[PDB]
Amino acid sequence: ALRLLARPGDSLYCRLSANVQMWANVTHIMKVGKNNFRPPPQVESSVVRLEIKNPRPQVDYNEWDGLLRIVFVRKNRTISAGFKSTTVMDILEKNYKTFLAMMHDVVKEKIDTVLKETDLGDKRAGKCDQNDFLRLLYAFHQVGIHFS
């Protein structure tokens, strides 16, 4: 539950928080102690209220996950580093080949411009807000890179 309620910049801020928070708002109601059940569980319990947004924010379910995942592999590490992994370039490079169908150095350069122009390449996913990812999500779409 604390991951769901986690706010940007907090220790428990994670991919689950980022994904759920943009499709709904979660709020704490009460705390339930382990004594309140028998046989007593080894973990504490809680009650939360989930309010799903109507209308659903019009962003692709896959694209939002795709960007969130690659940057949350190391949340406390810089976003630029998260894209330095070799497989991140390979999975992303083919995704660009898909865009052209309907170049490793180029996708390297394109990523460099996006992180530099958005001024997001030097911050950490654990300290980022919905808007920051959305701006990151755009800047890749403009340069033709789609995550998922």
């Binding site: 924010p57 019009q58 692709d60 996950d65 995942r69 592999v73 070799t86 999975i91 959305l134 779409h141």
Partner: peptide
């Protein structure tokens, strides 16, 4: 929020299917 509204509104201009796009789930395959 109003900044968010522009971005999400602008996102409509750049939207594409995901069918052939390989998800980032493949990231760990290496």
């Amino acid at each position: 929020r109003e900044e968010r509204k522009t971005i999400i509104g602008k996102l409509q201009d750049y939207k594409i299917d995901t069918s052939l796009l390989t998800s980032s789930k493949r990231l760990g395959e290496g």
